[PDB]
Amino acid sequence: TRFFHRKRLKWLDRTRQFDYCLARRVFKSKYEENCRRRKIQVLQARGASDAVIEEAN
Amino acid sequence: SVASRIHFLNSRTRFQTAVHASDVAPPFLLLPLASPRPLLAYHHRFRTRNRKRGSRFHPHPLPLPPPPLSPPRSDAAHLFAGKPLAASAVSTAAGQQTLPPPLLRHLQGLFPVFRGPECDPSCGVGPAGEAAGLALLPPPSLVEPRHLEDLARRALQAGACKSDRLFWRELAARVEKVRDLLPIESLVRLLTILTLNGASGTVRPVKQIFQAFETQDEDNRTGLRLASETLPCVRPLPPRLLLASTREFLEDLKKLSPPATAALAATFAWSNCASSALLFALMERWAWRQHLGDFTPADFALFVSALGHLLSQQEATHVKYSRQARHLREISGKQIMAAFREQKAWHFTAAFFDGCCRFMATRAESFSLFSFASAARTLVENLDAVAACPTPDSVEALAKAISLFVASWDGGDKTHGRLATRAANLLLVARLLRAASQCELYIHLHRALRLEAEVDTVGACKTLLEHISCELGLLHSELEALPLLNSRGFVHISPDTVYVRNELLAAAGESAAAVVRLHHAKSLLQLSTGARVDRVKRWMRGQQAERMQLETLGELKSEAEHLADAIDRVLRERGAAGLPTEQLADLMEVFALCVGDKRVSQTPEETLSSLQALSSEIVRRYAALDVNQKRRIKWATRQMDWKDPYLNHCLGRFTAAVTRQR
Amino acid sequence: FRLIARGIYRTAKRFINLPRVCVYLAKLNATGDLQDLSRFLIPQVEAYFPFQLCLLAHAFGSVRLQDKVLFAAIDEALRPHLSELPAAMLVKLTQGYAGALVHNYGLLARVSLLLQQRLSRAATGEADPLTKRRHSGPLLPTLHHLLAFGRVCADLKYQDFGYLEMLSIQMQAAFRADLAVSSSRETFQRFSPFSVQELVEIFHRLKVNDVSLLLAALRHVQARMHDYPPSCVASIGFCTAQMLPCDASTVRQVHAQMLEVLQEAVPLLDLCSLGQLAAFAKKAKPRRNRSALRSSVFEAVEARVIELQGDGRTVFDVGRLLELLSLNGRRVSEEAFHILCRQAHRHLDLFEPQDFCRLARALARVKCQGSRGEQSEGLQASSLVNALARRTLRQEDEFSPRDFLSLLRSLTLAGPPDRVYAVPLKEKLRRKQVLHNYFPASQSEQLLESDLPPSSRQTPTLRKGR
Amino acid sequence: TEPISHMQEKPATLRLRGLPYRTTAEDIANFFEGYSLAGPPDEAIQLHRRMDGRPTGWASVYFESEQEARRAKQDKHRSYLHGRYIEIFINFETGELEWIHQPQLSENVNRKHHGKDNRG
Amino acid sequence: LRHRVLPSSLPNRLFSVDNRETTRFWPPPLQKEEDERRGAFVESCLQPSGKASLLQPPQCLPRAPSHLAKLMEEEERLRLYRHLKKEERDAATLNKFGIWAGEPIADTPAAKMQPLVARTCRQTMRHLQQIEIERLDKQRNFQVPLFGPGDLMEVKYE
RNA sequence: ACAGGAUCAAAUCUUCCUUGAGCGACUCGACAGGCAAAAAAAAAAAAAAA
RNA sequence: UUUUUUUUUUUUUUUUUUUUUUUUUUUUUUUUUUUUUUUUUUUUUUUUUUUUUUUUUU
């Protein structure tokens, strides 16, 4: 899957179809959102109040 | 076959006649019988030599989003440009990265590139650009057999959004692979869903009888919508699917409910695919019991229609292959020498037809106009006039049914809605009329022919002519006008209006055919019977005979005159360019019948005018008409004393089967 | 060039813009390589651009290379993009199929309706959404495009009455608008003298009698007579004569004037035009003196044939010409006949089964006249006869039995061929007869070594020499 | 209602082992009587089998909530079933990165001067 | 006057399982099996008499004489077509390359599409001894009497 | 590859020329297989489906 | 080029509207053995090396 993906990436790149900055932004946003949701759910698991949750994050 | 293609290429007279773009249909295909295929199983062994060395979850290739029309930017600075991009463009630019609804919603509040029409924040974007519902479903390939029906039904509820093709293609493939695991009843529903997806929003041919669903108003002056992408010429279902699925039904035919059988026949019909094995098996199962009675009026019609539609073509094809079979056979020289020395419509089971007839008769009142018409027109196909063969009793039953239906018909209850729907209803009424006409002729001919050796139909028939005369007159005035052949810089011609115009003209031609046939039907009545029969045969074959008279109609003379006036009015203001090719001679014949003992109708009929326009069409289409039609016309024209320099040029210098003989 | 070819083949898979090479190859006539490229072309059909696809199809079609595998793929691929391509690209895509003789009525139907809708939109006064910034062509079609497509249809044998209807109307309106011009500066703006020719050709090929249109065309021709080249007129007349009734007072007047110009303008005509001229002259139905017309025509064409002896590029109905020249007991000049015979050899590749018969009958009628000059047995073409015979024997599965019989008869009467070509025909005739139960009332061996060609060396004969 | 498989968030679930060959969905549904499940038996109960259709003895059971899951666990632990007692295990993490905390590896081991054992 | 097209020969040159034109009859021996099986199925399915065969799962096929006769025609046609096509290709191949695919001449595992194994070797070896014994037994003019250890016997040999 | 080209033009079945030697021959283009389990004198023996 | 005379009735028309056979855009389908045991799979490498572009011939 990695090899076929890389070949398709190269084809896309040569075709002027692939956007490096867009892919990087999507990647970073997804990773940061997953990290944020982990902490939010961990805090909610303890039964803290809405004010405590808002002040923590 | 090489010699057969060369003959078609070298042929100077064979062409592809098409009055309208929508008239063309996919070619007919006859599927073979299933058999064990050990070789295919051995070949399958070579396709799985390295599966152990590959992905265990996604071994198959990855779908590719469709490409754009114009080339992308030089530097591919889509994010810096800030312009909105389509779902496929975003997919292809973000590395085919999934954009769940939360991520898409977060990104839309930060950049305008994601603020596109297809970028729904509440649905998300799929890997392959999927959106608007399809993005919320998993790959078809990954769905278990047990969850296929629900997935397809949910998806059905969902140059824009070009990514659905991938999903449907995947689904199609999946179905095929999992054919042998799904319920027999669920298979039919899956096929129907696929056909609905493949033929959503289409228009049926003008000359076609069978139709899946009934046209209704949709929430343009005419209200009709056309699209070359969804042209009827396009096959909904690949033959592969059908071929694969064929075997399944043979094994569990007894487990199919009548509603499922009707849907199966309709799907087959829609696909244009046929199977002898299946056809016969379905034919030999259902029968009348003193069970066809279980079928409802709506399903019965469809089941009949499909069967007939298929069978006709089946027979036709059989006939064609019969003759080609001759050359494949080898002949020895001794046989050659010996030869040298020496030279010195019935496509229905009787039982089935009887049952159908009885069914119709018994529940005439339970049928609707569309269903009734569809059913009737199908069954009338077998009844011919050359003279197993159906019985007088059987035909009488259908006649009675027709009569009953006519008597119980309300005569329009939708308050005259959309023009296309009204035209379709008029055509259905004409079909009904046609059927009615044919039944009487068959009965009469049979009786008259059999007698030599050793039901009040007209009363019900009379109303259809009046209704058609009124509706055609109303719709002619209500429809918009268009240019005539006979008489920015460009003539405005909307393709959407010629469709309804052709529908109206086809209904008129149908009625003209029916009224013509009625004459013969009546005339057959007791000159000797044999002589009478001979006369009718002459008339039908297009031979020298006695002049045709209208008085024989009797009670129907006034209705015939009104119909002639209606067609004259229509043709005087709408030309003759939308008339059917298969019913051209009838329109000529009806005017010859009207020309008799006349007082004032001589001047309106010339002898632009309707006659002239008809002639103009005849001349135009002379390259398409059959020898029967040509002879009929040749005689008809003579009868009326119609002199045309153009028509006479073609009637004696452009055919060999008529001009080169006497 | 083999070097380059081989290299290209070798490095095929590394070509990003693979289609770009196909167009070059087709222009250079590199069929072999073009065929080979198909291997690698097929898999990447879904990757290329819609405009690339059309160019590929046109390149394939230009060379007369049938590739159903490729074509099918292309068609499949271009499904969702056919509603957004420009007129020129659609034209080229259809041409591609046309070239290869791929009877795609499904595609034809689609394109037909698209053109109609586009035209409607145009008529409505709607601007063009689609349109060195001019990279892509306009979306809306034109009369040239329409004609182009019509020709395609004609080629492919697709009788589209609905399309023709529209076409006729538009043409009629264009004619009418052009006849109202006040100055020569604004004449032949939307169309040229060559477009009516195309139209006529289309209509003739399709075997559709459109009087309303034909007459209209004729009228405009009559009007602007002086602006039409002789060649154009020739063709037009030839086409019209075989469709319209020559006895009509309407067309007669036109024909009469056409012929007069043609006779004067004959010297600038080629073989193709001379044939048409001859045909037209024959088919003409003048009211005035008629005997001299034909004579004059013939006497001129005969002369020009001689001057045109050195022509080896043009394609014409040699058979028809020769037949025409030998009607009503007319005797053909020896020089002319030899020239014609000479010229009639390169065309055999294009010769149809009817052409065969035509030629055969013309030669038989030429020889049946009798002796002429030193030739005691009359004019004969043995070299031609033998080639005809051999080609006929090779193409046994393309003649109807009725035609075959006649052909054989003709051949027999016109310088019977060699034994080797005479023998097998007998067998084939019998076979055909048996098969088809063909036994006309009018109707009422084994090859040996010695009969074979000497040059073939098929016999156990030792000859002297080197 | 969409299937659990296609859901974007799996509910509380357990794991069962040591099941006999003669096991079906209905057996587990009856086993788990008087408890609220995530759905009908066909969706809540999912048997484990290899490519050859051979059961591995493993099973997964869904629950409406973690409280119900734990209550069923504690009330059905070591419960006889077809002559064998079933072992119930938790099939969901808490979310904290507890795996980071690892024991202190031994620095002084003498196999030659210690009793034999099969400990890993 | 008409221009002749150039059909593509690439399908006839491409050799792979994906291409059907070059793999419709890939296995010489197994190609016959198909035919045989087809003939048996048609014979035992298309001509019912009352006895039920046990060759394949039951199917809801027609039983009317007219329908069966109709079907038979199709069957025949397909048979003929396949025969003709195979003949054609064989001829073409032979003409071009001269490649010939004849019938087996001997009974070998290769014929049966099986590998060579010691087991098979042993089997064959045993068979050879069997046959040799059988053959040798015939030549003798006397029957070997029953004897055992401790029994006085008198042998006579040349 | 009968792929290209010439000629008053070839038996069925190309008269003659070009392709440097049609890439040494055939074939493939999702082609090819290092390591692990198991087996294992060289060698051979497993279709895919947790 | 009217009157009139002669020839020809799908067999030979003063000539291909001309006689024959389109599967056409689709020749498309998973065999055998097998009461019961075991590894059936776990991982990686590999093809675009161009200046896509001199943007698709109004």
Automatic annotation (TrEMBL), chain A:
<protein>
    <recommendedName>
        <fullName>Ribosomal L22p/L17e protein</fullName>
    </recommendedName>
</protein>
UniProtKB/TrEMBL annotation, chain B:
<protein>
    <submittedName>
        <fullName>Uncharacterized protein</fullName>
    </submittedName>
</protein>
UniProtKB/TrEMBL annotation, chain C:
<protein>
    <submittedName>
        <fullName>Uncharacterized protein</fullName>
    </submittedName>
</protein>
